[PDB]
Structure formats: structure tokens, C-alpha cells
Design an enzyme around this catalytic site. Structure first.
Site, PDB file in Angstrom:
ATOM      1  N   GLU A   1       0.685  -1.523  -0.134  1.00 46.69           N
ATOM      2  CA  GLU A   1       0.127  -0.039   0.007  1.00 46.69           C
ATOM      3  C   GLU A   1       0.805   1.260   0.361  1.00 46.69           C
ATOM      4  O   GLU A   1       0.157   2.453   0.346  1.00 46.69           O
ATOM      5  CB  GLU A   1      -1.138   0.259   1.117  1.00 46.69           C
ATOM      6  CG  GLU A   1      -1.643  -0.884   0.633  1.00 46.69           C
ATOM      7  CD  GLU A   1      -3.025  -1.313   2.191  1.00 46.69           C
ATOM      8  OE1 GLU A   1      -2.475  -1.582   3.507  1.00 46.69           O
ATOM      9  OE2 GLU A   1      -4.253  -0.964   1.861  1.00 46.69           O
TER      10      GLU A   1
ATOM     11  N   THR B   1      -0.228   2.119  -7.750  1.00 44.16           N
ATOM     12  CA  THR B   1      -0.354   3.748  -8.641  1.00 44.16           C
ATOM     13  C   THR B   1       0.199   4.573  -9.580  1.00 44.16           C
ATOM     14  O   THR B   1       0.231   5.001 -10.310  1.00 44.16           O
ATOM     15  CB  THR B   1      -0.741   4.564  -7.480  1.00 44.16           C
ATOM     16  OG1 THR B   1      -1.945   3.891  -6.825  1.00 44.16           O
ATOM     17  CG2 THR B   1      -1.486   5.271  -8.088  1.00 44.16           C
TER      18      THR B   1
ATOM     19  N   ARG C   1      -8.028  -0.201  -5.600  1.00 45.93           N
ATOM     20  CA  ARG C   1      -7.160  -0.578  -4.417  1.00 45.93           C
ATOM     21  C   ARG C   1      -7.230  -2.677  -4.545  1.00 45.93           C
ATOM     22  O   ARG C   1      -8.578  -2.664  -4.396  1.00 45.93           O
ATOM     23  CB  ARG C   1      -7.235  -0.679  -2.571  1.00 45.93           C
ATOM     24  CG  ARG C   1      -6.455  -1.325  -2.185  1.00 45.93           C
ATOM     25  CD  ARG C   1      -6.556  -1.975  -0.907  1.00 45.93           C
ATOM     26  NE  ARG C   1      -5.678  -2.553  -0.736  1.00 45.93           N
ATOM     27  CZ  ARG C   1      -4.430  -2.794  -0.943  1.00 45.93           C
ATOM     28  NH1 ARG C   1      -3.552  -1.997  -2.033  1.00 45.93           N
ATOM     29  NH2 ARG C   1      -3.408  -3.920  -0.216  1.00 45.93           N
TER      30      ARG C   1
ATOM     31  N   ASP D   1       6.197  -4.128 -11.176  1.00 45.72           N
ATOM     32  CA  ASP D   1       6.306  -3.562 -10.489  1.00 45.72           C
ATOM     33  C   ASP D   1       5.619  -5.227  -8.930  1.00 45.72           C
ATOM     34  O   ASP D   1       4.685  -6.009  -9.895  1.00 45.72           O
ATOM     35  CB  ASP D   1       4.453  -3.382 -10.253  1.00 45.72           C
ATOM     36  CG  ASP D   1       3.579  -2.758  -8.792  1.00 45.72           C
ATOM     37  OD1 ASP D   1       4.267  -2.869  -7.729  1.00 45.72           O
ATOM     38  OD2 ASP D   1       2.962  -3.215  -9.426  1.00 45.72           O
TER      39      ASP D   1
ATOM     40  N   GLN E   1       3.504  -6.577   0.198  1.00 42.79           N
ATOM     41  CA  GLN E   1       3.481  -7.200   2.166  1.00 42.79           C
ATOM     42  C   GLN E   1       3.778  -8.418   1.450  1.00 42.79           C
ATOM     43  O   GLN E   1       4.387  -9.046   1.142  1.00 42.79           O
ATOM     44  CB  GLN E   1       1.576  -7.854   1.622  1.00 42.79           C
ATOM     45  CG  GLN E   1       0.310  -6.615   1.959  1.00 42.79           C
ATOM     46  CD  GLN E   1      -0.954  -7.490   2.322  1.00 42.79           C
ATOM     47  OE1 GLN E   1      -1.219  -8.363   1.517  1.00 42.79           O
ATOM     48  NE2 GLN E   1      -1.577  -6.385   3.422  1.00 42.79           N
TER      49      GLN E   1
HETATM   50  N1  LIG Z   1      -4.352   9.993  -1.639  1.00 40.90           N
HETATM   51  C1  LIG Z   1      -3.563   9.221  -2.188  1.00 40.90           C
HETATM   52  N2  LIG Z   1      -3.683   8.280  -1.796  1.00 40.90           N
HETATM   53  C2  LIG Z   1      -3.082   7.212  -3.135  1.00 40.90           C
HETATM   54  C3  LIG Z   1      -1.540   7.848  -2.911  1.00 40.90           C
HETATM   55  N3  LIG Z   1      -0.749   6.809  -3.513  1.00 40.90           N
HETATM   56  C4  LIG Z   1      -1.190   5.648  -4.290  1.00 40.90           C
HETATM   57  N4  LIG Z   1      -3.026   6.139  -3.538  1.00 40.90           N
HETATM   58  C5  LIG Z   1      -3.609   4.981  -2.945  1.00 40.90           C
HETATM   59  O1  LIG Z   1      -3.146   3.895  -1.803  1.00 40.90           O
HETATM   60  C6  LIG Z   1      -3.956   2.743  -1.925  1.00 40.90           C
HETATM   61  C7  LIG Z   1      -2.914   1.908  -2.009  1.00 40.90           C
HETATM   62  O2  LIG Z   1      -2.309   1.856  -3.339  1.00 40.90           O
HETATM   63  P1  LIG Z   1      -1.114   0.565  -4.064  1.00 40.90           P
HETATM   64  O3  LIG Z   1      -0.972   1.518  -5.964  1.00 40.90           O
HETATM   65  O4  LIG Z   1      -2.330  -0.805  -4.778  1.00 40.90           O
HETATM   66  O5  LIG Z   1      -0.192   0.593  -3.053  1.00 40.90           O
HETATM   67  P2  LIG Z   1       0.757  -0.781  -3.461  1.00 40.90           P
HETATM   68  O6  LIG Z   1       2.529  -0.137  -2.987  1.00 40.90           O
HETATM   69  O7  LIG Z   1       1.284  -1.233  -5.203  1.00 40.90           O
HETATM   70  O8  LIG Z   1       0.325  -2.629  -2.843  1.00 40.90           O
HETATM   71  P3  LIG Z   1       0.876  -3.038  -2.344  1.00 40.90           P
HETATM   72  O9  LIG Z   1      -0.152  -4.174  -1.285  1.00 40.90           O
HETATM   73  O10 LIG Z   1       0.372  -4.151  -3.889  1.00 40.90           O
HETATM   74  S1  LIG Z   1       2.184  -4.098  -2.596  1.00 40.90           S
HETATM   75  C8  LIG Z   1      -4.687   2.759  -3.727  1.00 40.90           C
HETATM   76  O11 LIG Z   1      -5.686   2.896  -3.407  1.00 40.90           O
HETATM   77  C9  LIG Z   1      -4.025   4.038  -3.866  1.00 40.90           C
HETATM   78  O12 LIG Z   1      -5.466   4.803  -4.681  1.00 40.90           O
HETATM   79  C10 LIG Z   1      -1.248   9.051  -2.581  1.00 40.90           C
HETATM   80  O13 LIG Z   1       0.336  10.121  -3.317  1.00 40.90           O
HETATM   81  N5  LIG Z   1      -2.297   9.791  -2.100  1.00 40.90           N
HETATM   82 MG   LIG Z   2       2.186  -3.124  -6.403  1.00 38.38          MG
END
Ligand SMILES: Nc1nc2c(ncn2[C@@H]2O[C@H](COP(=O)(O)OP(=O)(O)OP(O)(O)=S)[C@@H](O)[C@H]2O)c(=O)[nH]1
Ligand SMILES: [Mg+2]
Length: 316
Positions: free
Chosen positions: A11, A16, A146, A168, A172
């Protein structure tokens, strides 16, 4: 040909950033692609309202109006529809009344006590728009979704005459074991940290501070000799959420020695320093730090422009 690897705890915003690349460089999610995320939007929205309602039981928070008890019943009866990409007027109304309740709001504002999607308020504040007949997710609605990364996602785009391949993986604890499958031929690592995770604990482990876990990962990757000649880019992400959060939630929950004020600039700088100080070879190895809002195309555009410049100057 340039290879970029997105790394970071769950997360942190990695996938994103991958979407933003597609939006800025490629040219946006088509209508067919947007409609595909419709069920994810509804799923994320229903999961969020359920997660708050669940926490109210754990935390013994009553609804503000007792009549919401019946909306909460109707919520579960009608929620299966949303998973399939449908949203009746009846289901929207139920969710809306729930979301407006003062007890539900009291619990929403206590979300660091449980696990709640970052985009909960974003969709829940936009119910009237997302519930409309023939709703089609906007670019921003797609960015806000998400879904957990399992496996390794590969995306390709062209920028500044360069072929990018972007990798990517999931962040987790269960997916960390798979990071090593991506370690060959990397031009640059983009290491994402959720700045607003400083007061949260891991979904996979309630006793671990999210930001401490992020520090351990950075320490590992940044000081891995395998990556001596790979550019290390640090994105201090979710700066919009951070900004808001820092006003009401002390940084000392994470860094008990923090002596600065509850303001964006001082606290952001301090987190940057904590991460950059994990670099064991500061005179031979540079970290390129940027503060990001992954959901904001104009921010990511200008930041990725600067990142590319550096990659272009350093690799060749
Ligand atoms: N407000 C806001 N939300 C964000 C920002 N960056 C990501 N998000 C939100 O956070 C949530 C998690 O982001 P995501 O891109 O899935 O993280 P991830 O690193 O890929 O997570 P993972 O479990 O598969 S490893 C998503 O709903 C996304 O829209 C940000 O800079 N600001
Ligand atoms: Mg990811």
C-alpha cells in the site's frame, strides 16, 4: 531500453505510480478499460463502509441515529450486487445515510485503530456520482482503486525516446520472497514509502509500525551491493494524506525523539533524513528523493520528468 523496478511495503503506492505512467505517457484508460474497474470501485466502496461498521463493534461505537441499524442490515442484504458491478438506488441511499451518521464518522476518524483503505472517503464522499446510472470510472477513480499485487506486473511505455519497462511486485510480507525474481538488469529502483503510514500498523501484523517496516526494507535494498550501480530513487508518497494527518496525529508515535513541530515541512524533512540516513555508503552512493502524490498526474509528471533526466544523465 530502461528497466525500472517498483519496490516498497504494501500500500505504498507502487501500482498507482504504474497507472500514472500509462495515463501520462500512454494515453489514459479507454472506456472499456474504465468499465472493467467499475466493479473494483464498487467493491472498494462497500469494503470500506463495511470495514468502518465492523470497527464500530470492536470499539463499541453506537450509531448516532438508531435508525441506521436497519440501513446496516440492508447493507449486507444488498452488498453482493456491488461486487458484480451494480449499484441500485436503494444501495446508494443506505451507504449514504450510513456514511453521514455521526457514529460512523466518529469511527472513520479513528481508522488507525483498524485497517481501512486510503480511498474510503474519496469514494464515499462521491457516492452520488459513482452510483449514477451508467457510471463509468474516471482516470482518478481508477488511480484510487486498491487491489493487492500478487505476482509481478510488467508495463511498457515510451518517453523521451526511451523504452521503459516497469516492474511492480507486491510489498506485503507474503510477497517479499518474490522480489528476488526481479533483481536482474535494473536501471533504477523506485522505492515507494507511504508518508502517512507513520501512525499505522501492518495489516499482516498489528505490533509492527508500518513506517518502521518500510525503513527495514529500504535499509535492505539501499545497502544491497547487488544494487551498487543501480540508481536508487526514493518516493516519499502520499504527501497529500501526510499533510492532513500531521496536523492531528503526533509524529512521535513513530519517532519518539522527533522534536519538531506538527507541520508538513519539518516532519516531511525529518522522515526523509531518517530514510536517507540508512544509507551506509553516503559518500559513494546517492539517493534521489522526491515527495509524491501518486494519484496526482501533474505531480507525477513533473517528478518522473526529473527522475528520467537523472537516469538519462547517469545510465548512460
Ligand atoms: N490520497 C492518495 N492515495 C494514494 C496515493 N498513492 C496511492 N494511493 C492509494 O493508495 C492505495 C494503495 O496504493 P497501491 O498503488 O495499491 O499501493 P501498492 O504499493 O501497489 O500496494 P501492494 O499491497 O500491492 S504492494 C490505492 O487505493 C491508491 O489509490 C497518494 O499519493 N495519495
Ligand atoms: Mg503493487
Amino acid at each position: 531500453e530502461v528497466k525500472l523496478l517498483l519496490l516498497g511495503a504494501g500500500e505504498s503506492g507502487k501500482s498507482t505510480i504504474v497507472k500514472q505512467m500509462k495515463i501520462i505517457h500512454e494515453a489514459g484508460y479507454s472506456e472499456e478499460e474504465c468499465k472493467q474497474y467499475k466493479a473494483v470501485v464498487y467493491s472498494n466502496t462497500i469494503q470500506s463502509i463495511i470495514a468502518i461498521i465492523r470497527a464500530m463493534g470492536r470499539l463499541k461505537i453506537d450509531f448516532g441515529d438508531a435508525a441506521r441499524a436497519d440501513d446496516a442490515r440492508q447493507l449486507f442484504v444488498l452488498a453482493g450486487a456491488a461486487e458484480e458491478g451494480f449499484m441500485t438506488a436503494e444501495l446508494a441511499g443506505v451507504i449514504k445515510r450510513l456514511w453521514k451518521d455521526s457514529g460512523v464518522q466518529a469511527c472513520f476518524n479513528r481508522s488507525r485503530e483498524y485497517q481501512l483503505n486510503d480511498s474510503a472517503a474519496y469514494y464515499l464522499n462521491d457516492l452520488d456520482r459513482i452510483a449514477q446510472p451508467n457510471y463509468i470510472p474516471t482516470q482518478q477513480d481508477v488511480l484510487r482503486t486498491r487491489v493487492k499485487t500478487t505476482g509481478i506486473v510488467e508495463t511498457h511505455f515510451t518517453f523521451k525516446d526511451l523504452h521503459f519497462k516497469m516492474f511492480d511486485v507486491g510489498g506485503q510480507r507474503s510477497e517479499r520472497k518474490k522480489w528476488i525474481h526481479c533483481f536482474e538488469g535494473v536501471t533504477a529502483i523506485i522505492f515507494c514509502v507511504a508518508l502517512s503510514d507513520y501512525d499505522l500498523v501492518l495489516a499482516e501484523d498489528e505490533e509492527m509500525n508500518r513506517m518502521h517496516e518500510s525503513m527495514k526494507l529500504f535499509d535492505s535494498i539501499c545497502n544491497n551491493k547487488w544494487f551498487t550501480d543501480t540508481s536508487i530513487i526514493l518516493f516519499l508518497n502520499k504527501k497529500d494524506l501526510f499533510e492532513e494527518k500531521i496536523k492531528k496525529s503526533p509524529l512521535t508515535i513513530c519517532y519518539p525523539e522527533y522534536a519538531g513541530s506538527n507541520t508538513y515541512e519539518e516532519a516531511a524533512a525529518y522522515i526523509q533524513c531518517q530514510f536517507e540516513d540508512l544509507n551506509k555508503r553516503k559518500d559513494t552512493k546517492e539517493i534521489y528523493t522526491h515527495f509524491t502524490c501518486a494519484t496526482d498526474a501533474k505531480n507525477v509528471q513533473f517528478v518522473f520528468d526529473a527522475v528520467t533526466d537523472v537516469i538519462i544523465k547517469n545510465n548512460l
